[PDB]
Amino acid sequence: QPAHLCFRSFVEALKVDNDLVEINTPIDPNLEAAAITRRVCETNDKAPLFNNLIGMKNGLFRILGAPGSLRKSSADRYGRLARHLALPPTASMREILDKMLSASDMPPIPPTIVPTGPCKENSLDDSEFDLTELPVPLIHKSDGGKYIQTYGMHIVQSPDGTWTNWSIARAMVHDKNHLTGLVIPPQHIWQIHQMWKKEGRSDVPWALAFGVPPAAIMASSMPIPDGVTEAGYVGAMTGSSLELVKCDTNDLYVPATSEIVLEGTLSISETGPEGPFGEMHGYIFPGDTHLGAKYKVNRITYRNNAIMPMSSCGRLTDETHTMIGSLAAAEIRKLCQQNDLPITDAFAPFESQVTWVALRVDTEKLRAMKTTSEGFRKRVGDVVFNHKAGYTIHRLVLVGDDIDVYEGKDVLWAFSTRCRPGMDETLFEDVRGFPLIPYMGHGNGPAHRGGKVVSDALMPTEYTTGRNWEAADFNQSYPEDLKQKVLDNWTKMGFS
Amino acid sequence: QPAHLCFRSFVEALKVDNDLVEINTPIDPNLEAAAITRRVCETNDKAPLFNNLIGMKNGLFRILGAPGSLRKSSADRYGRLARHLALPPTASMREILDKMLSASDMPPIPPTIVPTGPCKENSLDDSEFDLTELPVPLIHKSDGGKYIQTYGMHIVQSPDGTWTNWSIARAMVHDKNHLTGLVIPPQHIWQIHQMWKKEGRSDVPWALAFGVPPAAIMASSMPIPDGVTEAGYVGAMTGSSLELVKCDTNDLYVPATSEIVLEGTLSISETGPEGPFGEMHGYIFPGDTHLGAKYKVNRITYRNNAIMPMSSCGRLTDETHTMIGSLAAAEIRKLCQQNDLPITDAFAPFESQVTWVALRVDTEKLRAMKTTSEGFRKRVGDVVFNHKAGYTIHRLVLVGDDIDVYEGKDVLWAFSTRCRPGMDETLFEDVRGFPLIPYMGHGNGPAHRGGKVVSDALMPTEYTTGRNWEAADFNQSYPEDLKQKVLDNWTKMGFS
Ligand SMILES: Cc1cc2c3c(c1C)C(C)(C)CC=[N+]3c1c([nH]c(=O)[nH]c1=O)N2C[C@H](O)[C@H](O)[C@H](O)COP(=O)(O)O
Ligand SMILES: Cc1cc2c3c(c1C)C(C)(C)CC=[N+]3c1c([nH]c(=O)[nH]c1=O)N2C[C@H](O)[C@H](O)[C@H](O)COP(=O)(O)O
Ligand SMILES: C=Cc1ccc(O)c(OC)c1
Ligand SMILES: C=Cc1ccc(O)c(OC)c1
Ligand SMILES: C=Cc1ccc(O)c(OC)c1
Ligand SMILES: C=Cc1ccc(O)c(OC)c1
Ligand SMILES: [K+]
Numbered sequence A, B: 001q002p003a004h005l006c007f008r009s010f011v012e013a014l015k016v017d018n019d020l021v022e023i024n025t026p027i028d029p030n031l032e033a034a035a036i037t038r039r040v041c042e043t044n045d046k047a048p049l050f051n052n053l054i055g056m057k058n059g060l061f062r063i064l065g066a067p068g069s070l071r072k073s074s075a076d077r078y079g080r081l082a083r084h085l086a087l088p089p090t091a092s093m094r095e096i097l098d099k100m101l102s103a104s105d106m107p108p109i110p111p112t113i114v115p116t117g118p119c120k121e122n123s124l125d126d127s128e129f130d131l132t133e134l135p136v137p138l139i140h141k142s143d144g145g146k147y148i149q150t151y152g153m154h155i156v157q158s159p160d161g162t163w164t165n166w167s168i169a170r171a172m173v174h175d176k177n178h179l180t181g182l183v184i185p186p187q188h189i190w191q192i193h194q195m196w197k198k199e200g201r202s203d204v205p206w207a208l209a210f211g212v213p214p215a216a217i218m219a220s221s222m223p224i225p226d227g228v229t230e231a232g233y234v235g236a237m238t239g240s241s242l243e244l245v246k247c248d249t250n251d252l253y254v255p256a257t258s259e260i261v262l263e264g265t266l267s268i269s270e271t272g273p274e275g276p277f278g279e280m281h282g283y284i285f286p287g288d289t290h291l292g293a294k295y296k297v298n299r300i301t302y303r304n305n306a307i308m309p310m311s312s313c314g315r316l317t318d319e320t321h322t323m324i325g326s327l328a329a330a331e332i333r334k335l336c337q338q339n340d341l342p343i344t345d346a347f348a349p350f351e352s353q354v355t356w357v358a359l360r361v362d363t364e365k366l367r368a369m370k371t372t373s374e375g376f377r378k379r380v381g382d383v384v385f386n387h388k389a390g391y392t393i394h395r396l397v398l399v400g401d402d403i404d405v406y407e408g409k410d411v412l413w414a415f416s417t418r419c420r421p422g423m424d425e426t427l428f429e430d431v432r433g434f435p436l437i438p439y440m441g442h443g444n445g446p447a448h449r450g451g452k453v454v455s456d457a458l459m460p461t462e463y464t465t466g467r468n469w470e471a472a473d474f475n476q477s478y479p480e481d482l483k484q485k486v487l488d489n490w491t492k493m494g495f496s
């Protein structure tokens, strides 16, 4: 099966790409696997495949770290993400994001039910497994539990059956047959959970599938609209109907080639201790445990020689930057355009810890609007900060056509030089805030409200008559013929 | 003579360091010299020495570009600056800045008058030179003149004789015997000029010396206090009295080994067209010419085979970043400490286009102050933004002890994650602003007032009981023995 449709094939692809290190000697899931993966992510090294994990038994499990992290070279920097999507390994971020958005103006392609698949090769009933006995990793030394779930897909369905959501939300082992995790607004797992809670009759049927089709884990990480079934979006994106098999103990459907599947329920009444966890912004607050959602596991099914993907998240650069930030930016770009805003491109700079999004403006269209900075900033911020796709983002930076938003150096240059602090900014205190940013949940103000800003790095004439400067750089401050002469004589003269 | 005391020896040092490219074929001062230098600065390449400049005659002049720019390797990144100061080429920014501050608690060492020096080897009187005939460079294609003065030292003295100031301020050729340039508040050349204007009796005696002792051009670029004669500060810093010779046509004193010396007057009454110029923030606004100060040149003296240093300034990284920003940061650090603020380190991130300064706080001392963010931010901003050393800086970022302010990635991480927009910031609208930043002089508000901010990236407990997190990074999230094992097995396992 193709790499984008089958996680086991994706691992093969990374090998072929010389983007995998297989470690066949014993590695401890207590910190060691995650420490190696952390170093990989901080250095953009090859993805680690831990084939000999201390405590692996009943055939559960090997670990792949850094599945969505960056490669060292500029030419294939985003190659691991490209391999989730059937794209060439040299694909740009713009091409990746365009692929992820493509299904938003296509009919869904619903999944196809098949009678079995690799994920049924082995099973353990509720007398046979113990989650505390599996080689679940301790990812950061101060974590409040062993985080089994960092790169699987939670599957829940609305009570009426009309929306089945696929998403990534963290979860850790509670005891032999339960997990605790985050289920928080405005996320779709929360929205669905609230539907079940209001009905009040039963716990939520649930499954958690690890090592799903790579195209599916990408949509799982993206804030596509409310009420949209990810399976149909991924079908449209890939041009093919995804093959799903029914769970054994409930009527949910999981990808046929899933590495590992947990079946059970998400409680509408029970909670348990969850966290702390070393998170996307680069921090852990030791001891900050709070009550989280509680999951009961009834059954495990899995492939022969199952592989568990793992994100060792924190400081730059890992899946929480490359996927959470970029995919939110993509959805924001679309949102803006659908609201008649002249936004061509959006990206969450990694340098901002993916807390900013830079919005590139078609300034010809802006000029025709005959507006001002104050008005335009307010409009943009009301659209984005009142929408779920804006949830994680606390600063929007508006830039004109000369800036490549996918280049952090250029966004930083424009922000620092074109946006006057205070005057060229609008603060938003009555919007939903993202509590995981330290200055929110551990800060001086309300954890869940405010702390957002639109920073206008458009210069005045960009609203009126057009750009009135040239950059003082090699590109813009010298005529073409001179530039080319310099380049052509560069190494002759003695330069590198 | 040592490299730090003699510009001709400094050029030799760069050669020996394999940090110089000598170009002996003809190079045009109309854009070509500056284009090559621009590319050098954008790539951190070796400094260019143009030995065969089209239009060089009466022995005037060769050009050295990029005298204070960065080298490619991390180990000697600041080596060119180190060579201005007798420091090892691996010197850190902290050691450079400490050397530049060292004279601030030493007695001055006044200069020594000597009867002649290399700068007297040749002369041209006012019937023999024509500034329009010299190979003065056109540095950026849209510049409003040929900027002769980008790395020389203006020398002016108070009417009472008690303060002689050395500083860099730009100037361009007006006609055969005049320059125009910037003379603006709160700069010391302006302060002195105002003294002469109030006396109202004569033009200001002036000299402009190019290719001065490297230690002298560094102090020329630093905002040491009002009323302090740079020659005595540089004497103290270097531990030696600088050797000066009297001008021929006035009673000012210039470094004995100066490459080129202009003698004349700065008018107290006349102005002429000046600019535009491709400036430190990365911009030129074509056509933005304004009236500037006017200089009359009466005499030129110069060394055999004179070399003119040139800054081809603009986008990162050149002398306007490495020297203006870092040296202002140094002076700010001292200022803060002298005002009883618990600041250990300061640096202007290059990523901010040197418009920010990050201030590292001794948080043990902060805790003893039993204060709050609001109070502390106001205190810091009142001290810095009301002082000349703060003039160029529009954002101060307060960070705790874990952050290395000389590492832009780390400052950006702390700013983005620890400072809540609005709430954790104090805006300053009634302070002097820096008009050359585009969002000031070409922005939406007053060019000369306001637009400043203190951004507090201290977390709440840093004021009270101490840091309450660990980073989610390899360094902080894993025990020492594990880290060392990982490192020791890194290349064995198959990583880079
Ligand atoms: C890629 C990715 C996405 C994480 C994530 C991680 C990764 C690796 C982790 C597992 C390492 C740690 C935590 N994360 C959470 C998370 N969203 C959330 O609500 N809680 C989480 O705990 N997300 C983001 C969530 O997937 C996106 O916001 C989706 O838009 C959610 O899908 P939905 O729109 O269908 O709700
Ligand atoms: C290194 C450096 C410093 C420039 C500078 C440049 C460089 C290369 C240029 C030449 C390429 C272009 C312009 N610059 C000006 C300038 N200060 C100023 O008032 N006007 C200028 O035009 N400075 C900064 C000025 O040197 C510092 O602010 C000093 O503190 C001034 O000395 P003072 O404190 O004695 O006034
Ligand atoms: C290396 C790329 C690549 C792409 C898709 C595949 O299915 C694959 O299988 C080994 C490899
Ligand atoms: C906890 C992580 C996290 C990540 C992204 C989200 O959109 C989110 O919404 C509650 C939560
Ligand atoms: C290479 C360093 C260096 C340092 C000081 C000198 O005077 C010098 O003369 C050639 C060279
Ligand atoms: C024009 C440049 C410039 C650079 C630094 C300064 O402190 C300054 O004060 C007026 C001016
Ligand atoms: K999703």
Ligand SMILES: [K+]
Pocket: A418, A419, A420, A424, A456, A457, A458, A459, A460, B439
């Ligand atoms: K602006």
Ligand SMILES: [K+]
Pocket: B166, B167, B168, B219, B220, B221, B222, B223, B224, B230
């Ligand atoms: K000075």
Ligand SMILES: [K+]
Pocket: A439, B418, B419, B420, B424, B456, B457, B458, B459, B460
């Ligand atoms: K703060």
Ligand SMILES: [Mn+2]
Pocket: A165, A166, A167, A188, A223, A224, A225, A228, A230
């Ligand atoms: Mn969804």
Ligand SMILES: [Mn+2]
Pocket: B165, B166, B167, B188, B223, B224, B225, B228, B230
């Ligand atoms: Mn001075």
